[PDB]
Amino acid sequence: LGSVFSVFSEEGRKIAICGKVNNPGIIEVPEGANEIIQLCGGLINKSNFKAAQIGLPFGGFLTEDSLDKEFDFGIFYENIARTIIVLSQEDCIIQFEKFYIEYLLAKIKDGSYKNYEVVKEDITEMFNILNRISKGVSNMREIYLLRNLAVTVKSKMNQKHNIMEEIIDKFYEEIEEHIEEKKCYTSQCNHLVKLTITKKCIGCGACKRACPVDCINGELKKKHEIDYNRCTHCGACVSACPVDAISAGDNTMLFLRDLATPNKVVITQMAPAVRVAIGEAFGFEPGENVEKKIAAGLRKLGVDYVFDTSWGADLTIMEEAAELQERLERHLAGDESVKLPILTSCCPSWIKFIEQNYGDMLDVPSSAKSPMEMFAIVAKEIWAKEKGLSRDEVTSVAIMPCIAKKYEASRAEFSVDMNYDVDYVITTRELIKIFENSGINLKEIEDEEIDTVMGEYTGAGIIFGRTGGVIEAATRTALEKMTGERFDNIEFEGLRGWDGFRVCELEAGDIKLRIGVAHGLREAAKMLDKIRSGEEFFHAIEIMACVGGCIGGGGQPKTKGNKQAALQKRAEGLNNIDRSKTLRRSNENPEVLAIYEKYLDHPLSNKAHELLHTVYFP
Amino acid sequence: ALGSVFSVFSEEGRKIAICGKVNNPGIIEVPEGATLNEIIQLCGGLINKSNFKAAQIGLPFGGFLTEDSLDKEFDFGIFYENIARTIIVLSQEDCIIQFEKFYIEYLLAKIKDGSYKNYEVVKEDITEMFNILNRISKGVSNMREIYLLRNLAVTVKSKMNQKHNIMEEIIDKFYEEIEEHIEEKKCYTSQCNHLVKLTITKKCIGCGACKRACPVDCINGELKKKHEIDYNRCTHCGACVSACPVDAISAGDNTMLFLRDLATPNKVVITQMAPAVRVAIGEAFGFEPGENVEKKIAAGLRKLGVDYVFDTSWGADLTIMEEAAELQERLERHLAGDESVKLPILTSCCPSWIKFIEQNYGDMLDVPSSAKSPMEMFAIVAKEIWAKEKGLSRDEVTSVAIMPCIAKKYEASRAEFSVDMNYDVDYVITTRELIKIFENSGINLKEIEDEEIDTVMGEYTGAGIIFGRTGGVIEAATRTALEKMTGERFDNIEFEGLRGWDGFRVCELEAGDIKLRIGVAHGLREAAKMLDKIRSGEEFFHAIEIMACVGGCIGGGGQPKTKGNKQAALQKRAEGLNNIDRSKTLRRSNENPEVLAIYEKYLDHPLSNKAHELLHTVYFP
Ligand code: SF4
Ligand code: SF4
Ligand code: SF4
Ligand code: SF4
Ligand code: SF4
Ligand code: SF4
Ligand SMILES: [Cl-]
Ligand SMILES: [Cl-]
Ligand SMILES: [Cl-]
Ligand SMILES: [Cl-]
Ligand SMILES: [Cl-]
Ligand SMILES: [Cl-]
Ligand SMILES: [Cl-]
Ligand SMILES: [Cl-]
Numbered sequence A: 001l002g003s004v005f006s007v008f009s010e011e012g013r014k015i016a017i018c019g020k021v022n023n024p025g026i027i028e029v030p031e032g033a034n035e036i037i038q039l040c041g042g043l044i045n046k047s048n049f050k051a052a053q054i055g056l057p058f059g060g061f062l063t064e065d066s067l068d069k070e071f072d073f074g075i076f077y078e079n080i081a082r083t084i085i086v087l088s089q090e091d092c093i094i095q096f097e098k099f100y101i102e103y104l105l106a107k108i109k110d111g112s113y114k115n116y117e118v119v120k121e122d123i124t125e126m127f128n129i130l131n132r133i134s135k136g137v138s139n140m141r142e143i144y145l146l147r148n149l150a151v152t153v154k155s156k157m158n159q160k161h162n163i164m165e166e167i168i169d170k171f172y173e174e175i176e177e178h179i180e181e182k183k184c185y186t187s188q189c190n191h192l193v194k195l196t197i198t199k200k201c202i203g204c205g206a207c208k209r210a211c212p213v214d215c216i217n218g219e220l221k222k223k224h225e226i227d228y229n230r231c232t233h234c235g236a237c238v239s240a241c242p243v244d245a246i247s248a249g250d251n252t253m254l255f256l257r258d259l260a261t262p263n264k265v266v267i268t269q270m271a272p273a274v275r276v277a278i279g280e281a282f283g284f285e286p287g288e289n290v291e292k293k294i295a296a297g298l299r300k301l302g303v304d305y306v307f308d309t310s311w312g313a314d315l316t317i318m319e320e321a322a323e324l325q326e327r328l329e330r331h332l333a334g335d336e337s338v339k340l341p342i343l344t345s346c347c348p349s350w351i352k353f354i355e356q357n358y359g360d361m362l363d364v365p366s367s368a369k370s371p372m373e374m375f376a377i378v379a380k381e382i383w384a385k386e387k388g389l390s391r392d393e394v395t396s397v398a399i400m401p402c403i404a405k406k407y408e409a410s411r412a413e414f415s416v417d418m419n420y421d422v423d424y425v426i427t428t429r430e431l432i433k434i435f436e437n438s439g440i441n442l443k444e445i446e447d448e449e450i451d452t453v454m455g456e457y458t459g460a461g462i463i464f465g466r467t468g469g470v471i472e473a474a475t476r477t478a479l480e481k482m483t484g485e486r487f488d489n490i491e492f493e494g495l496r497g498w499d500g501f502r503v504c505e506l507e508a509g510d511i512k513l514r515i516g517v518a519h520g521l522r523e524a525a526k527m528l529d530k531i532r533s534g535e536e537f538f539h540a541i542e543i544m545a546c547v548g549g550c551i552g553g554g555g556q557p558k559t560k561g562n563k564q565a566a567l568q569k570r571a572e573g574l575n576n577i578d579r580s581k582t583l584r585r586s587n588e589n590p591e592v593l594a595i596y597e598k599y600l601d602h603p604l605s606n607k608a609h610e611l612l613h614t615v616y617f618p
Numbered sequence B: 001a002l003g004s005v006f007s008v009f010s011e012e013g014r015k016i017a018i019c020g021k022v023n024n025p026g027i028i029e030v031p032e033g034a035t036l037n038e039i040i041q042l043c044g045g046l047i048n049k050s051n052f053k054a055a056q057i058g059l060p061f062g063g064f065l066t067e068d069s070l071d072k073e074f075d076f077g078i079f080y081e082n083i084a085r086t087i088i089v090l091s092q093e094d095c096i097i098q099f100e101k102f103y104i105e106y107l108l109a110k111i112k113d114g115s116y117k118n119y120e121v122v123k124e125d126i127t128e129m130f131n132i133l134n135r136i137s138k139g140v141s142n143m144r145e146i147y148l149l150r151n152l153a154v155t156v157k158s159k160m161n162q163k164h165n166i167m168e169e170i171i172d173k174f175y176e177e178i179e180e181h182i183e184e185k186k187c188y189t190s191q192c193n194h195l196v197k198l199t200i201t202k203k204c205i206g207c208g209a210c211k212r213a214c215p216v217d218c219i220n221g222e223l224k225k226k227h228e229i230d231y232n233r234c235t236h237c238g239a240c241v242s243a244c245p246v247d248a249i250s251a252g253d254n255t256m257l258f259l260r261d262l263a264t265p266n267k268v269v270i271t272q273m274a275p276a277v278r279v280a281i282g283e284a285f286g287f288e289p290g291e292n293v294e295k296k297i298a299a300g301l302r303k304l305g306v307d308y309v310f311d312t313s314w315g316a317d318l319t320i321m322e323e324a325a326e327l328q329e330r331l332e333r334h335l336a337g338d339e340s341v342k343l344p345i346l347t348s349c350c351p352s353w354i355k356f357i358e359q360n361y362g363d364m365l366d367v368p369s370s371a372k373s374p375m376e377m378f379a380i381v382a383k384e385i386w387a388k389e390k391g392l393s394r395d396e397v398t399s400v401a402i403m404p405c406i407a408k409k410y411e412a413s414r415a416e417f418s419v420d421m422n423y424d425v426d427y428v429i430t431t432r433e434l435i436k437i438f439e440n441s442g443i444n445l446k447e448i449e450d451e452e453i454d455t456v457m458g459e460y461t462g463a464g465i466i467f468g469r470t471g472g473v474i475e476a477a478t479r480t481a482l483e484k485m486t487g488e489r490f491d492n493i494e495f496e497g498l499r500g501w502d503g504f505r506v507c508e509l510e511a512g513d514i515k516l517r518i519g520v521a522h523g524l525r526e527a528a529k530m531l532d533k534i535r536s537g538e539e540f541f542h543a544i545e546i547m548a549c550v551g552g553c554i555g556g557g558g559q560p561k562t563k564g565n566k567q568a569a570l571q572k573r574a575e576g577l578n579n580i581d582r583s584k585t586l587r588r589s590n591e592n593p594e595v596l597a598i599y600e601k602y603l604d605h606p607l608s609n610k611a612h613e614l615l616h617t618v619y620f621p
């Protein structure tokens, strides 16, 4: 178990400090009379002391009152447990107490402390209350409830200092803030964090210029703010700030805490484009596929199952190719109710982009969920059920190249009973930092395989990560099954290339399809304006918010050298992965076919709609 | 018990008990060669003329019939062993989600008491079904719910070795309705109270009466054209509903839900009732306006099946405990030179001022008290204290509020007054709706024997009871606050200045060294006059009361229509509340022993942290 911001995973007269102190470790503590942290190297950044837990399962809870005055050594309660989690002002009390309660509940559930069984349910309710607070679904009554629960527990455990009572006493203001203002001042509660420009804004106006939809108003050097109603979460502003004034959260600490929670099942998915960029932080060239290094590293961190978003992309193609074929058949049949083009793209940014500016084209996009959310729902409603786990007993973490995927995973449509299909997102950069600080070097770690049932993927799925790949995959499947012919050359070079707005004409048998591809939302605006004006007609379109597609996402490591060359290199790495696959059509993936044969029975069925489709623009 | 009809009536061989959406529920003698349609016709058809939707056979177990069985000889073999031979007929006016929630909950109760042991194995599964249905009725679902239900259905059908599980057929036959509920958040029959909004329906003729009645000018439309409500500015004052010559404006009706909950075995149902109900309901049963028939209401509610009868006036006493404290605090801070403080303080249980202030008086958001309404204070206490004391989780108690207006429906629907999808007030029934339930169920308040209200949350003072008429809220708060600020007990506790009937009233109360200027408005136009005068500085007030209805709550839109002169009847009801007040030994809220017990045992004193956590809310978040 370990914990620190900027990351670490730390795997008599001895203690174990793993809080917000720089340099986590065990250290041999001297017996001389505030600077104890200093002996551990101070706290991350220079954040002031908040508290220090003694013993992870249970001990004492120390607050500021012990800071500049004699820290009685022996007050480490006899059940010291030889570990200390030190808190700074950067740690949210709600999140920490959730982690504490879950650790205690796990050790109860495994028999380690049966003397606490009598209070098991009570503590569980505490967690539930805490969870509701972190999810923003609470009133102030929760405090009342917590207090009584605290009072109850301390009665049966006979304690003179009950942690929850003191938490209420000392951090009432933070809790009230969370509940009434729906605000977590440390931004650890990912479900209370919005993309926001903070006080470090200098009014340089870079974000205003960079925003493709002009989401930011504000003049001179006056603080700028994001008009969340039109924000596409494309993340251009975050990359453009001369400072760190724009924050969209960082779930690193949540990931570490979950990994350190005993008997908690943590599974991961990873976006197609991550595997060709992450290795750059460890000496690989752009485009080199290091997915097996990622798998081994994630397992070393403690991940119990490593899957792949490209599997979900194959499932997405099953649905989207089916819908494209249906729309084409209706169009050719003279049904004027149908709408063309059909948009196929896993990028959330088009949603807000279309609703606010192309409200005559709400019937264009496919109803299929993204590969990330398709994977997530299948993992919790089928795989976990298969393994006899309820959805809350599985923590599904998505490693993605984008902040927009954080926003998507936070959407309430992709959740049930306050359990989010994607529990949270970790970006490529954040994972790089986790690996770096935990001593995991992807260059030197031994390869490991991704887990099969939701990890196998075709080249159609993998090319999702670069511009033109989604529509290429969907077209592969749809044209091949509409013609009955297997293509000798399955690659559609017309859909490749790098122009911001690309037009392609694909001929297969009697079928002729006109395709539009845009990467960069301004080029997308050009293409959609052309569609509306009738200057051009399209059967299908792909829209990507980032130049180059997902390989150019804002959550990816900053490129080294020539930017365009590096992005093209990553895209061609995805294309080379595709060329190296035996299976290059999504409908060939045996595991996705198993999904259809055993649960959903065929694409566009009622069950398939219920699980794998959603309603954009409700 | 069992029973149902939309005019609502809990009706406590070759004989069947028909209790669906058929006119004339009852026990009927089936002719030999008879279809289902013939049985329905012998019961007089369905309420209104709605077409047949379905028919449940046997309350726990039987079959589920659709249109396909209507013109087909009713074979009695569907009445298998000990089915009790009952049929619940559904019309197109019944929501399938609500009915299946009732069915599943009934089956779960019959399992839970051991009479149906062989189904215990599916208990959890059936429970999950209910949860799914509940989530659908509350609008917190995705389409995945259907998937889940299907598998649960299959699971049950596997574990019971049954050839036809009802839920599978439900999905098959009403997929469109279920999908509507989930994706469109729409219950086309409007039985799901958490999906109903106040809307003008298609039966609107464009007469424009509602537009004229609206105090905030919230309704648009001309000539025969359908009128529309700008829901963003609507105060839910309910004037439009009262003005409509037709039934074009609908705000839901939880009557059937109330009946189903009453018919569910071993389900704890408790009620609170607003002060103004008891002086108006009796008008429907031969009493004069202003006559207090609260004990008749208690007996009638118990006859319907209510397990505990409490009183909103108790919550009004608790409200005064909090609000008098806040008023005293603000006065003391004002006298000390606190420019931090804001006056007046608004004390009123009426929801309508909230949006009214938010939409037009945004410089006065710090004016209203942070205290909840009496209804919601009762609700939080009932579920978080009373139910807890009796070893019941909040979902094991169904708390029903009997109120005179649709604005209380809107308040009970607010998400702030809920936790984990449990609403503190499960739903509201109006005085009119309860009148119709009594009338159709054979409960006559004139001839029924009196019964007492339950004690712990039913005892109340005259200060609490006068809440139901204009000027009463501020009168009660003033009683308590002035008495405790002066240390003097008043010889005459009535403040005649706060009484009267003018739309905008000004009063000056003198007690010891204290001098308070009070403004009272009933009718939101009068409220606007008074708040404009406050804003211009033309008048100054220490505290104000705002009521949306003329005369206060006794004049609510959910009350029975008055007979004779409207104003005279409303004044009669208000004076009935005043006479109840005069008949009470305790006439200050701070004397109520049960409210004081709340403070002594749980919250420790008004305006404490615990009291804020439970009895206060944030209007204008
Ligand atoms: S870029 Fe960063 S700093 Fe420059 S204005 Fe936008 S936010 Fe403020
Ligand atoms: S994210 Fe993309 S859209 Fe939202 S503000 Fe920053 S730039 Fe404009
Ligand atoms: S393109 Fe790929 S990366 Fe850029 S935003 Fe859309 S999804 Fe995130
Ligand atoms: S009153 Fe009823 S009918 Fe006349 S306009 Fe308003 S709604 Fe339409
Ligand atoms: S309720 Fe009151 S406010 Fe809302 S519309 Fe009808 S009248 Fe206007
Ligand atoms: S006054 Fe009483 S009745 Fe009229 S609306 Fe406000 S609360 Fe409902
Ligand atoms: Cl683990
Ligand atoms: Cl995705
Ligand atoms: Cl493999
Ligand atoms: Cl980048
Ligand atoms: Cl199947
Ligand atoms: Cl069943
Ligand atoms: Cl009952
Ligand atoms: Cl009330």
Ligand SMILES: [Cl-]
Pocket: B385, B386, B389, B456
């Ligand atoms: Cl009690």
Ligand SMILES: [Cl-]
Pocket: B196, B197, B198, B251, B252, B406, B409, B410, B413
């Ligand atoms: Cl309503």
Ligand SMILES: [Cl-]
Pocket: B452, B453, B454, B455
């Ligand atoms: Cl009594």
Ligand SMILES: [Cl-]
Pocket: B554, B555, B556, B557, B559, B560, B561, B562
């Ligand atoms: Cl009336």
Ligand SMILES: [Zn+2]
Pocket: A092, A093, A094, A095, A134, A178, A183, A184, A185, A187, A188, A189
């Ligand atoms: Zn937090």
Ligand SMILES: [Zn+2]
Pocket: B095, B096, B097, B098, B137, B181, B186, B187, B188, B190, B191, B192
């Ligand atoms: Zn419904």
